[PDB]
């Protein structure tokens, strides 16, 4: 089906929609944020993510959108400055990870393994930072090379 899959991610900076090569995310921790602008609990969760991001600045937050319209998606990216997948239908990613509801937030290690599947519920406990720092401190990352340095077919497709 895909000759090249997920070549680019996107973000808003200085009022402008920008692209970033998906190879930028090789070898990084990621936080996959499954959300939508029309979901009140997703909008509230942004405040939890912002606190998370300050404490874990090297984890790259990626918005996986479930907006109904491109305009909704754009206003969400503008307000959060997160990186995001292009606007599209990502139900297949929900199916792969058996995501039950929005918001969800998964912490992924550099080789695409799941470090914390339930991280949206974890960060809502507001008692988690030291424990998570230690979890990451104690996790031995194993490198993994991906074709074209693009990790996302492995992460999102089967």
Numbering used by the authors: 22 to 179
Show the paper's wording:
The PfPlrx monomer (12–179 aa) contains a twisted seven-stranded, mixed β-sheet (β1, β2, β5, β4, β3, β6, β7), surrounded by five α-helices (α2 to α5). The longest helix (α2) in the PfPlrx structure comprises five turns with the typical thioredoxin active site motive WCXXC (W59, C60, K61, Y62, C63) at its N-terminal end.
We have obtained monoclinic (space group P21) and hexagonal crystals (space group P61) of PfPlrx from P. falciparum, both diffracted to 1.6 ​Å. Manually rebuilding and subsequent refinement resulted in a PfPlrx model, comprising residues 12 to 179. Accordingly, we used this model to obtain the hexagonal structure. Furthermore, the N-terminal helix α1 is missing in the hexagonal structure.
